[PDB]
Motif scaffolding. Sequence first.
Motif, PDB file in Angstrom:
ATOM      1  N   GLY A   9       9.493 -10.819  33.365  1.00  0.00           N
ATOM      2  CA  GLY A   9       8.309 -11.645  33.547  1.00  0.00           C
ATOM      3  C   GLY A   9       7.342 -11.743  32.374  1.00  0.00           C
ATOM      4  N   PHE A  10       7.838 -11.513  31.168  1.00  0.00           N
ATOM      5  CA  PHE A  10       7.000 -11.334  29.995  1.00  0.00           C
ATOM      6  C   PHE A  10       6.975 -12.627  29.189  1.00  0.00           C
ATOM      7  CE2 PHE A  10      11.211  -9.431  29.536  1.00  0.00           C
ATOM      8  CZ  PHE A  10      11.769 -10.280  28.589  1.00  0.00           C
ATOM      9  N   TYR A  11       5.967 -12.741  28.321  1.00  0.00           N
ATOM     10  CA  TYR A  11       5.846 -13.871  27.413  1.00  0.00           C
ATOM     11  C   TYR A  11       6.816 -13.709  26.261  1.00  0.00           C
ATOM     12  CZ  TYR A  11       1.605 -15.185  29.889  1.00  0.00           C
ATOM     13  OH  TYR A  11       0.711 -15.614  30.851  1.00  0.00           O
ATOM     14  N   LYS A  40       8.109 -16.066  31.350  1.00  0.00           N
ATOM     15  CA  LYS A  40       7.019 -17.038  31.221  1.00  0.00           C
ATOM     16  C   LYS A  40       7.368 -18.195  30.307  1.00  0.00           C
ATOM     17  CE  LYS A  40       3.135 -15.156  33.522  1.00  0.00           C
ATOM     18  NZ  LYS A  40       4.057 -14.295  34.373  1.00  0.00           N
ATOM     19  N   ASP A 116      -0.169 -16.411  38.659  1.00  0.00           N
ATOM     20  CA  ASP A 116      -0.832 -15.507  37.718  1.00  0.00           C
ATOM     21  C   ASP A 116      -1.206 -16.235  36.429  1.00  0.00           C
ATOM     22  OD1 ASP A 116       1.933 -15.780  37.481  1.00  0.00           O
ATOM     23  OD2 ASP A 116       2.082 -14.040  36.134  1.00  0.00           O
ATOM     24  N   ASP A 117      -2.221 -15.719  35.753  1.00  0.00           N
ATOM     25  CA  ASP A 117      -2.622 -16.208  34.434  1.00  0.00           C
ATOM     26  C   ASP A 117      -2.913 -17.711  34.442  1.00  0.00           C
ATOM     27  OD1 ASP A 117      -2.218 -13.574  33.782  1.00  0.00           O
ATOM     28  OD2 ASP A 117      -0.656 -13.930  32.250  1.00  0.00           O
ATOM     29  N   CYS A 157       2.573 -14.278  44.099  1.00  0.00           N
ATOM     30  CA  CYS A 157       1.759 -13.556  43.126  1.00  0.00           C
ATOM     31  C   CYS A 157       0.367 -14.172  43.084  1.00  0.00           C
ATOM     32  CB  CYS A 157       2.395 -13.572  41.736  1.00  0.00           C
ATOM     33  SG  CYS A 157       1.519 -12.484  40.597  1.00  0.00           S
ATOM     34  N   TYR A 161      -4.532 -10.416  40.683  1.00  0.00           N
ATOM     35  CA  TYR A 161      -3.340  -9.589  40.856  1.00  0.00           C
ATOM     36  C   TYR A 161      -3.513  -8.146  40.388  1.00  0.00           C
ATOM     37  CZ  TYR A 161      -2.352 -10.744  35.850  1.00  0.00           C
ATOM     38  OH  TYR A 161      -2.412 -10.863  34.471  1.00  0.00           O
ATOM     39  N   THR A 192      -0.270  -5.472  40.338  1.00  0.00           N
ATOM     40  CA  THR A 192       0.052  -4.660  39.169  1.00  0.00           C
ATOM     41  C   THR A 192      -0.692  -3.329  39.151  1.00  0.00           C
ATOM     42  OG1 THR A 192      -1.632  -5.512  37.573  1.00  0.00           O
ATOM     43  CG2 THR A 192       0.382  -6.844  37.880  1.00  0.00           C
ATOM     44  N   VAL A 196      -4.099  -4.621  34.562  1.00  0.00           N
ATOM     45  CA  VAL A 196      -2.870  -5.319  34.206  1.00  0.00           C
ATOM     46  C   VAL A 196      -1.774  -4.312  33.873  1.00  0.00           C
ATOM     47  CG1 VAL A 196      -1.820  -7.066  32.736  1.00  0.00           C
ATOM     48  CG2 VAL A 196      -4.273  -7.232  33.308  1.00  0.00           C
ATOM     49  N   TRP A 220       4.404  -5.162  40.689  1.00  0.00           N
ATOM     50  CA  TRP A 220       4.887  -5.690  39.419  1.00  0.00           C
ATOM     51  C   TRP A 220       4.305  -4.741  38.391  1.00  0.00           C
ATOM     52  CZ3 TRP A 220       5.895 -11.373  38.187  1.00  0.00           C
ATOM     53  CH2 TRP A 220       5.964 -11.603  36.808  1.00  0.00           C
ATOM     54  N   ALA A 225       5.664  -2.902  29.489  1.00  0.00           N
ATOM     55  CA  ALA A 225       5.622  -4.210  28.866  1.00  0.00           C
ATOM     56  C   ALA A 225       5.025  -4.098  27.466  1.00  0.00           C
ATOM     57  CB  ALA A 225       4.808  -5.170  29.736  1.00  0.00           C
ATOM     58  N   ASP A 227       4.766  -7.237  25.373  1.00  0.00           N
ATOM     59  CA  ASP A 227       4.582  -8.596  24.861  1.00  0.00           C
ATOM     60  C   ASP A 227       3.179  -8.854  24.326  1.00  0.00           C
ATOM     61  OD1 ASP A 227       3.203  -8.634  27.317  1.00  0.00           O
ATOM     62  OD2 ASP A 227       4.229 -10.448  28.075  1.00  0.00           O
ATOM     63  N   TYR A 228       2.211  -7.966  24.561  1.00  0.00           N
ATOM     64  CA  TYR A 228       0.828  -8.196  24.163  1.00  0.00           C
ATOM     65  C   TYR A 228       0.459  -7.584  22.808  1.00  0.00           C
ATOM     66  CZ  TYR A 228       0.600  -3.525  26.225  1.00  0.00           C
ATOM     67  OH  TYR A 228       0.845  -2.210  26.570  1.00  0.00           O
ATOM     68  N   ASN A 255       8.299  -4.676  34.709  1.00  0.00           N
ATOM     69  CA  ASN A 255       8.268  -5.682  33.654  1.00  0.00           C
ATOM     70  C   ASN A 255       8.335  -4.945  32.318  1.00  0.00           C
ATOM     71  OD1 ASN A 255       8.000  -8.267  32.467  1.00  0.00           O
ATOM     72  ND2 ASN A 255       5.760  -8.038  32.288  1.00  0.00           N
TER      73      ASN A 255
END
Lengths: 426, 418
Positions: A9-11, A40, A116-117, A157, A161, A192, A196, A220, A225, A227-228, A255
């Motif tokens: 579920g990541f960017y 995403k 989400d987002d 979702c 979240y 989550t 987050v 989740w 994760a 990706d950030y 994730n």
Amino acid sequence: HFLCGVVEGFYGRPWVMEQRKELFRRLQKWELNTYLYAPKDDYKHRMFWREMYSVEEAEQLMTLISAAREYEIEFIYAISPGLDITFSNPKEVSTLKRKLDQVSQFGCRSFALLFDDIDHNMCAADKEVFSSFAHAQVSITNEIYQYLGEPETFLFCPTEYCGTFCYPNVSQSPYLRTVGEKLLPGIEVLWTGPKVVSKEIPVESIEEVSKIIKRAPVIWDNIHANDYDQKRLFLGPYKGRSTELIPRLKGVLTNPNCEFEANYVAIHTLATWYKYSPQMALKLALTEWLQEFGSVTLEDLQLLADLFYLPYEHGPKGAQMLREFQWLRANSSVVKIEEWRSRAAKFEEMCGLVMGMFTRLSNCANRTILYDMYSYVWDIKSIMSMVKSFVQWLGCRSHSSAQFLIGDQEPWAFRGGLAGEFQRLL
Amino acid sequence: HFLCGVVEGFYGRPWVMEQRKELFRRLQKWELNTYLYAPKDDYKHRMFWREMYSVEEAEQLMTLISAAREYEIEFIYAISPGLDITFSNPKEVSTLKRKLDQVSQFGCRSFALLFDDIDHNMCAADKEVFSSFAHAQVSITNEIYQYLGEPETFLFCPTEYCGTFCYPNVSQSPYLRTVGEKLLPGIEVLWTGPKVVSKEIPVESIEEVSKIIKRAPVIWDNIHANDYDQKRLFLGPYKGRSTELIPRLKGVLTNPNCEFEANYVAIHTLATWYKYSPQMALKLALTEWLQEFGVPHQYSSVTLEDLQLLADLFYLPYEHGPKGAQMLREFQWLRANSSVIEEWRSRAAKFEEMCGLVMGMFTRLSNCANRTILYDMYSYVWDIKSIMSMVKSFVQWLGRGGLAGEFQRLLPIDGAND
Ligand SMILES: CCNC1=N[C@@H]2[C@@H](O)[C@H](O)[C@@H](CO)O[C@@H]2S1
Ligand SMILES: CCNC1=N[C@@H]2[C@@H](O)[C@H](O)[C@@H](CO)O[C@@H]2S1
């Protein structure tokens, strides 16, 4: 059943199909059961969510859904329509069904709607029909749920979240109270934790949120994760969630790192935790991971996991090198002086173990694993090497007055690019 | 003839076969002529150089060399044995020939032996036979050259491959003089300029090195290489090398970003240079680049200004593009003058609208049709977007990095080139 497995579920660059087949294999070998498809930036999942799959995309998607069946992994197809859907327009709603029907015809029995987002506001048209944002989403989520024959697994979702995203708080959120009140009991709610990326997920926080959504939620989890933050990678064990959460939870979907091969430990320790000591789980995961490399030693992998551990914690071997370095820098004026040099030499020998770890990884047979992690390992190697050089320079100041950098430099002595220049002004 | 094209010669994940075929196409469209295969971490190229290719690998390599022929791109196969080769052991030497023969039978006519990024000391056995490290490399390079019939193109990369790497200097290097004096005249010598990443490559420095290696060198250029820093990417134009270099050089092979799709500008402007203004070349390259940023076909977008901004945020190793320097200067001024009046707030608003243009670039890139292009650049763009949004919020307020970052901020040379 309790859902436990992986959400993609990541960017960013999503995994390819051959990687996803390998993930089902691993989930089954470790006795997990669920895969949630939600990358995403796979364009038909979110940005162009209304668009049907092409003939070739459909063939890849059915071949992939069959592999999940073959490996007894539940395949959950998600869709993220919230950037630009008009909730009160019924062809919008039909376009969503048409889209989900197409994936149904690939063999898919489990689905999720993700909100989400996204902004918390609606378009003008939607504000006349629905009394709030929460009303618009559950309205279409219920309608979709029932339209597809009220399926085995359906996930929702929310926009709020995690703890900090609840306004004003979790217990009094008019968005979440509407969700719990009006979302159909067979639909699950994704969460989550307090944040987050939750350092811990206390049970009192899960009782709190469960009371207002009238359901035990599905986690989740973004603990692994990465990706950030370009520079970050998380090889530590699953940590911060008591096994007492399992009976108070409908499931846990992790994730993990965008780099597929870097998630061996992230998924192995989740598996072990699903049956708990984080350090013992890590030893089992690192030991089993070792022989997919053959040269690399267990000690090398221990160091590597400790340099790239968890979002709020470095591993023991990484924290020690950082403390030794902070002590060395602080106490460097004295160049008792015999303690400084004794700990400087020991500090340099530990830097050597980072150098030798990188060297042996670089010679290993599993090139797939090496490529997923190469940039991270070279990053920490080269910074440790400049740190070792800096400590040596500090020790040489009782016999030299030369600056640490003499003369013209290669571009890598100055790190981060333009992004780095902006960060240092913060 | 003069060689101009690309060396895939960087550390980390190398390009795959479908990416390299695409590279030949672009090289041909832009009238470049050469590709040098040299990925440092393609295991059969360096770490396990002695091992033959399997039959599945041989079929991929043969299909790839055929494409180079089909697209009129000369294919130069390099190999890097220098980490653990024993030069005086004839079993080592036969394994090297047995390796190159295998690739020869794939259709390959041009070869290179690379001795870059290795220690300068030899094993005990080899110090008996050869009088110096340079002798041992030239001995086996000459032997390999002649063994395969003295092929049209054969390149040799020295360990002292740039000005700063020469001991003590370029003009008096015992290593390079042995190379120039003893490497056979038909073999070419690779050189990266004054530095590994040369900001400029002056004419006099090429005169200096050419005199001591007795031949014009082939430039292996790392101006756009970005394997040495996770966070960096170079979309700026080819720059710092006068076209007066072309008659003094045997060729120019650029070693560019690891991210395949990010090297449109890097290779487009090298082509332009080979036939010069860096900013005119950038405009032509970005203009042409724009047309592969499509919108997906819908059944129920990136501008030129977006791309200018993206290239200026990820420009060149020694200079940011104008729009990035501008935002960085404005931010410093806002912070410095934050102790406070209508000038501040007037330029703060203009600064956050520039921040908005970074976000808007990222959003439209995210919607573009060429997903390959987006994936190669996503984490770079994700990074600058989210940092600018934090910078923008910080400017309003006035009205990370991992363990590596923690170590970096403790060094005094942090930000010392800002
Ligand atoms: C279930 C909540 N939805 C979320 N969408 C984002 C994810 O796509 C990211 O991968 C994650 C970590 O960077 O942060 C949030 S969490
Ligand atoms: C022809 C000189 N040999 C060289 N080997 C390294 C390359 O593989 C790197 O990719 C480049 C950029 O880091 O810097 C040097 S240059």
